[PDB]
Structures are given as C-alpha cells and as structure tokens.
Enzyme design. Structure first.
Site, PDB file in Angstrom:
ATOM      1  N   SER A   1    -116.652 -14.651  -6.120  1.00  0.00           N
ATOM      2  CA  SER A   1    -116.285 -13.334  -5.542  1.00  0.00           C
ATOM      3  C   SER A   1    -115.441 -13.502  -4.269  1.00  0.00           C
ATOM      4  CB  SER A   1    -117.516 -12.504  -5.285  1.00  0.00           C
ATOM      5  OG  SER A   1    -118.474 -13.243  -4.551  1.00  0.00           O
TER       6      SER A   1
ATOM      7  N   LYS B   1    -113.241  -7.589  -2.851  1.00  0.00           N
ATOM      8  CA  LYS B   1    -113.302  -6.284  -2.136  1.00  0.00           C
ATOM      9  C   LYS B   1    -111.907  -5.656  -2.047  1.00  0.00           C
ATOM     10  CE  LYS B   1    -117.571  -6.562   0.617  1.00  0.00           C
ATOM     11  NZ  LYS B   1    -118.178  -7.891   0.692  1.00  0.00           N
TER      12      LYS B   1
ATOM     13  N   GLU C   1    -117.128   1.656   6.879  1.00  0.00           N
ATOM     14  CA  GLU C   1    -118.130   0.936   7.704  1.00  0.00           C
ATOM     15  C   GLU C   1    -118.142  -0.532   7.282  1.00  0.00           C
ATOM     16  OE1 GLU C   1    -119.972   3.813   6.000  1.00  0.00           O
ATOM     17  OE2 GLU C   1    -120.328   2.716   4.136  1.00  0.00           O
TER      18      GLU C   1
END
Ligand code: NA
Ligand code: NA
Lengths: 389, 385
Positions: free
Chosen positions: A371, A82, A104
């Site tokens: 990930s 991310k 968010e």
C-alpha cells in the site's frame, strides 16, 4: 448507504444536506466519460498508474511455498495508495464547482495526499491536524506547506485526530457550498465508504489484468492490511465475484490481541455507531469507544469500514491480525531480500503473506497489496531497533 | 573510450586489466537478448518503468510561453533516475559471475541506489563512506543497512569522499574477479561514461514516444540538470541525431559563477586529467582542482562527464547555470503549482525551463527531465527558510 446490516448516515441534520448533494453529484460524474477521462489522465501522467505487479522471487524461494506477488502502490506519486482517492475526490469537488478542499490527518499521509491533489487541480487546501500531531510530524507539515496547503493546528481538546475531525465537520457544515470534505478511507457516513472504494478499485482492476497476463490465471489469495480498509477494498472489490479467490484483511494486532493494545476492530470489536457509520469498533466493558494502538500510524484506528464488516459477516473475506513485532520483522525482511522498503502498514500484509505462503504449494499465487513505501517510518523502526538487546 | 578529444582510460595498469574485462563483458551483453530481457523485466516490474511524461498545464499557463512537459524520473523506485544505472550495472555484474558490488557515497544517494539493486539481485554490497559523511547522513546509512548493505567506514585521512574512492579503488584492484565497482554517473575511466549513458538512454527513448503521442511532434528544447551528466545524457542521447531538437544542460551556478562557490565545470572549468578521464574540471591559479559548491548535493562535483564536453565543443548542446536561490524558487514553485516536490538537482533544470519557456511561443514544446523527488532535500530546504 448499507452493506448488509452495516453503514448508514448517522449524522446531525446539519450534515444531511451536504451529504445528499455529494451523493447526487457522484451519481452524475461516476459514469460521465469526461470525469473518467480526466481522472485516468491524472492517474497516468501525474500519479504514474499503472503500478507494476512485482514477483518477489527471492522472498518466494526463501519461504519455499506459494509465489508472492507485490502490487506496487509504494510507487504511486506520494508513495501511498491514498493518492488514488485524493485525486478522485479533488476532481469530483472541482467538477461539482467547489474551490476548496478540507481533510484531517494524524501522521500526515492523508494530509500530504490531499495537499498534493489540491495543488494539481489548483484548489485551496486546509488540513485539520492536532497541534500535538503537528509537533510530532514537522516534515509532513512542511510538505503540506510546500504543496500550497495551510495546516490548521487544532489546539482545542486533546490536540489529536478526534478534535481535527470535529473542527473539519464544523467547517464543512458552513462551507459545503464551495468546500469539499475529502475523507481518506472507506469510513464515515454514506456516500464516503462507496466513493473511496470506487476510487481505489483501480488497484484490483490492474492487479487482475496483470496476474492474468503474468500467470494466465487469477490469484489463490489476495492479502491487504486493513486500517479503515481503503487499500484492502481497492484490491478486493474487483475479485469479490471470483469465488475461488480468497480475500484476507490483516488488522493491527499491536502488542497482541489479548493485550487490549491493538486496532483489530473486526477481530475484537463490537457492532455499534461512531463517526456516522454502523460498523465494528473497539469498545470497553461499558460500551465506550476504546483507544486503539499500532506501530503503523495508518492502522491505528478504533473503527473499520462497513463494507469489511459485511464481507466478514457473509464470510467472503477472512480477517486476521499481525503484531507490531511481526510487522517490524517483515519491514526488515522485504528491505534486505527484495530492496523494497515497505510502509509499516503494508508490512502487516507482507508478514501474514509470508506465513500463509509457507503452508501453500509453489504453483499457488498470493498477491500482497504493498500500500506504501516506508521512508516515512524509518525513525519509528530505528527507535524499535535501538530498544533491542 | 573517446568523445572527440575527451574521455580515455588514464589509470594505473592495476586498474587497466579490470576495466578491459568490463569492456569485453559489456560488448558481449549490451545487445544480448537475455540480458536486455532481464533488465527490461526489472525496470518494468521493480523500478516501475515506463515513467510518465506530465504536461504542467498550470506552470505553462502562469508563465504564458512554451508548453512545459516533465519526464517523471521522480516516480522511479528509489525516487531518482540513478536506479536505472544501478539495476543495469548490478545485473551485468551478476551475469559476469560477480557475487559482490562496491561503491562510494557522501550524501548517501548512490549508496542507497547500489544497496537496493544489490538486494534485488541477491549480491553482497559494501559501500565505502567517509566517517565524517556517515555522521552527517545517519538515515541514509540506516537505509543501506536495512537494504542488507555493509557501510565500511573510512577514518583514513580527512574521512571524506576522496578517501572512500581510494579505498574502493584499492578494493576493486584486488577483488575485480568476484566484485564489480558500481559508478553512479557518466564520469571516470572508459567504459563507465558509455555504460552509464546507455543505462539512462531509456529516459529519452520513452520521452520521444510519449511526446509524439501527446503532441505528434518532437520537442523544441530538452532541459536536464548536469552534475556528472547521467540523467542529461539519458534524455539527450536519443534526440542527438534529431538536429531540430535543442539540448540544454543546466549545471549548478551555486552562490554565483563569479563568487567561486559553483560546480559549472563545462562553463568556467579547464581541460585536465583527473579520476581517470580527460574532461572539464574546476581549477585554481595553481592548476589544482578547486572545491565545488551546490545546495543540491548531486550537482556538487568539480568534474563533468566527457561526453558533455564533446557536445559543448561541437555546439550540439548548450550548457547554462542556475543559482542556489533560483533552484529553491523552482522547488517551491513546482510543489505549490503542480503538486510535485522535485529534487534540488532537478529544481535547477525546472528554473531555466521556466525562463526559456517565456522566450518561446505557446505552440513550441519544452521537455524538462525531473531526475528525482525532493523528500531527501526537505531538511536542506527548511534550513534555508
Ligand atoms: Na481498526
Ligand atoms: Na560539475
């Protein structure tokens, strides 16, 4: 804005202007040498790119089939892929002349990634989080506080993610002149699905170079977990034109595909419009958006990115599901066999790769996108381990 | 064995044999092509070396002094420099034909590092832990169990680290033939102080190449936090024969050096023989070992590495101290300004580097060793808020 018959920009006229402004600015900077120099500089010196491609020798030998490689996104600063997208969109916003970032988060991972990227580039960060999620995620709120971000507790509605999205969109419409809305997956209205995939494609580009150097050939299969689909698109995109490289997305099978308690949008969802995009969404018998479930918070999303809907339709990628139980087994297995504690999201990809490896030749190669790391998931796994016997 | 007038092998004869066998093995392997090939392979593909050198532009600018670079050991697999030594010793053990690793831990950090390395290399891991410490670190005990390690709980005596060390030492005396005792800092009897420094020297060698790439000159100062002294020795050692480069270790000042709640051994410690080494230890009026204190659990040690005592003596490296409050200040500051949550241990080194930066000019360079990330210290920092 379209990936075949999927994508688009299904938003109120109030959001059309801001998105048009974002698309134009992205068109300017995406190929601009200085933007890319600064992005690559931050990804190297701050995020620690490149991430290694790791041969899981012991796991591979235990299964007795295909070589299993792990793309080590767990080692990126913040512990999840991310960060790649958070840096990209924060730098784009700063070069656009924005001074503030809004986002968010449900579990807090995107919120932390956004807060981190904001601090790096000296921008203000306001994270919209439902007050129910705030009470569930004390450490992630403290983390975001430490990183110089303000968590705006959303007490309105269900005090969940949906409410935080609405308050974040309502914020952006008013503030878009100085504020950028940092979306954390390949979802929502154009140009977000394209931008987020472009900022995650560095995963695939490294992985391609790394497997060619290590094995002198492309992988047979790439396996990635699919929530919204950003880590999957990231590792997939650079191999799309490599026809013999099989692409497998692993969705959250939850309590089982027949239980109605999962997040397998591509597997069991229907084509429709939600969150400003045309894609697959979990729907009830009426056609209302059905609530989703996964043990992995990052996979717990009724929808999926439109580019994955396109890759499925043209059969370029296969989409499968792994259960909460299978992901938990893979979490424990990788931990004890390779000394790597995976994110429960990533454990879905590890679970499917272990099954696929068993049926494949020892000369064949699987790349799994790891990930993130599973430090954030230790409480969830402990509770599930305590519910055994 | 000796760093000037410090170090040695001050142990019972039961331990001398195993330590001598470890000396021989290390000599055979330290420069061995295959051992170094495998070690570098695991450090690259598993631990994620090389770690970056980060220019803290915003911290440098707000101070208005020397340019502050951060050696990002916080990005190593496990989130601390400890992994470098864990892989090194674990591999050495495997190539020595050892099937088992043992260690002790109180906070749990060295236990996790050992458990991770043991898992990677397919070795049995038993971690001796005081029953009190087990209760206080439930998640780090779960981590070790997840990594396939056995936490052997020590209820004998006070159920603390002291008891766990004794039980582990008794184990190695018996099991040295098939078991390696993994030490996590540059402390205890030879050859451990030399081995741990050699497995951490990668930090300084990378930093040197990286600073010459970024600036085309060596740094003016290198600042590293000193507990036992592994991360500091790691970043220091390669720059020792670069006379122009100043080396500053930052010990834990705790509640204050005057308060009697600190771990600044090289500062207020006295020379003694404990834990099988001749080095600076914190001592009371009786000459007995005084209890250490630091908000940072990794710096909370009454003892210090003998090689730091040598560098202090010959005045090659200065040793200063920073308080629990100054560290917490640096923890919040780096987090908010650079978007890197540091370990409370590493926060001590940042705190002094911010002070020493102001004193120096804009053209001069400080490299600070960011030994770990502060995810592990979040509960401690919230409690002190
Ligand atoms: Na989904
Ligand atoms: Na000390």
């Amino acid at each position: 804005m379209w990936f075949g018959e999927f994508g688009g920009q299904y938003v109120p006229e109030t959001l059309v202007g801001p998105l048009k402004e974002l698309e134009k600015a992205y068109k300017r900077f995406k190929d601009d040498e200085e933007f890319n120099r600064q992005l690559n500089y931050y990804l190297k010196t701050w995020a620690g790119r490149p991430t290694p491609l790791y041969y899981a020798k012991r796991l591979t030998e235990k299964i007795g089939g295909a070589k299993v490689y792990l793309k080590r996104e767990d080692l990126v600063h913040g512990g999840a892929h991310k960060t790649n997208n958070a840096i990209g969109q924060a730098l784009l916003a700063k070069l656009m002349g924005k001074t503030r970032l809004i986002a968010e988060t449900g579990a807090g991972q995107h919120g932390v990634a956004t807060a981190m990227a904001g601090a790096l580039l000296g921008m203000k960060v306001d994270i919209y989080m439902g007050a129910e999620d705030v009470e569930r995620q004390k450490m992630n709120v403290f983390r975001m506080k430490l990183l110089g971000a303000n968590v705006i507790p959303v007490n309105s509605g269900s005090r969940t993610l949906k409410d935080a999205i609405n308050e974040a969109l309502r914020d952006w419409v008013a503030t878009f002149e100085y504020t950028h809305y940092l979306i954390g997956s390949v979802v929502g209205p154009h140009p977000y699905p394209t931008i987020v995939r472009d900022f995650q494609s560095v995963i695939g580009r490294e992985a391609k170079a790394q497997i060619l150097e290590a094995e002198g050939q492309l992988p047979d299969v790439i396996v990635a977990c699919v929530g919204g689909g950003s880590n999957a698109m990231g590792i997939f995109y650079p191999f799309v034109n490599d026809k013999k490289v099989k692409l497998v997305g692993v969705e959250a099978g939850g309590k089982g595909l027949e239980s109605g308690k999962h997040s397998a949008s591509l597997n069991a969802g229907q084509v429709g419009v939600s969150e400003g995009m045309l894609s697959y969404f979990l729907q009830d018998e009426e056609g209302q958006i059905k609530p989703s479930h996964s043990i992995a918070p990052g996979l717990d999303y009724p929808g999926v990115g439109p580019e994955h809907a396109y890759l499925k339709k043209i059969q370029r990628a296969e989409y499968v599901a792994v259960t909460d139980e299978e992901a938990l087994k893979a979490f424990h297995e990788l931990s004890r066999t390779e000394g790597i504690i995976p994110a429960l999201e990533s454990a879905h990809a590890v679970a499917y790769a272990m099954k696929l490896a068993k049926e494949m030749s020892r000369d064949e190669i699987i790349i799994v996108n790891l990930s993130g790391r599973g430090d954030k998931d230790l409480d969830i796994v402990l509770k599930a381990s305590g519910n055994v016997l």
